[PDB]
């Protein structure tokens, strides 16, 4: 059921750089995950214009931010296009390889870690605040999957048995013990207003 895969040497190096470099502006992780959600939502909305049946799995196009203090998790949920098994194992890793190389060169040339999203590898900014990342996803053409990694050179992929999603992606951030500020209502609201205020989809900040 659960399969284990090795990250490509370039992506393992990217993850080590994110985890090891001293960089206090960690809050940019949220903008990067919301932008990936917005790109996924644009994609399913565009596709539905020529094929309305692509919305049979859900008409609603939104982003939900869910903090859970008992679990120490921050979940970013979207009803976007979702990802297939091939996206999780091969496709996105191929894109991430060229993106990492360009990001690495720019950093040596004086660029900042906040600029990560310009190189299409913004997802890995999750490791600035999370010790473990779980990705639950459902694409129209494939089954529901759970991707997972605590870095260290490997990731796992398995068919997900949890609550069926219909269509979209859930990025669950298992926060580091010193990164619990991102579970606070005031902190999340302040970050969304600062970096993600003009997203073209409704963003609901859930409370506890
Ligand atoms: C790199 C890259 C981008 N992403 C990503 C994340 C969320 C979403 C999301 N919330 O949906 C996303 N969406 C894309 C999927 C492909 C499509 O063509 C555009 C939108 C992409 C990921 C990567 C990786 O190397 C690891 C990973 C687990 C496959 C996730």
Swiss-Prot record:
It is found in: Nucleus; Cytoplasm; Melanosome; Cell membrane. It comes from Homo sapiens. Changing residue 82 to D: Abolishes ATPase activity. It comes from the Eukaryota. ISGylated. ATP binds at residues 36, 78, 97, 123. Belongs to the heat shock protein 90 family. Residues 3-208 are annotated as: Interaction with NR3C1. The TPR repeat-binding motif mediates interaction with TPR repeat-containing proteins like the co-chaperone STUB1. Homodimer. Identified in NR3C1/GCR steroid receptor-chaperone complexes formed at least by NR3C1, HSP90AA1 and a variety of proteins containing TPR repeats such as FKBP4, FKBP5, PPID, PPP5C or STIP1. Forms a complex containing HSP90AA1, TSC1 and TSC2; TSC1 is required to recruit TCS2 to the complex. The closed form interacts (via the middle domain and TPR repeat-binding motif) with co-chaperone TSC1 (via C-terminus). Interacts with TOM34. Interacts with TERT; the interaction, together with PTGES3, is required for correct assembly and stabilization of the TERT holoenzyme complex. The modification N6-acetyllysine is found at residues 43, 69. Molecular chaperone that promotes the maturation, structural maintenance and proper regulation of specific target proteins involved for instance in cell cycle control and signal transduction. Undergoes a functional cycle that is linked to its ATPase activity which is essential for its chaperone activity. This cycle probably induces conformational changes in the client proteins, thereby causing their activation. Interacts dynamically with various co-chaperones that modulate its substrate recognition, ATPase cycle and chaperone function. (Microbial infection) Seems to interfere with N.meningitidis NadA-mediated invasion of human cells. Decreasing HSP90 levels increases adhesion and entry of E.coli expressing NadA into human Chang cells; increasing its levels leads to decreased adhesion and invasion. This is Heat shock protein HSP 90-alpha.
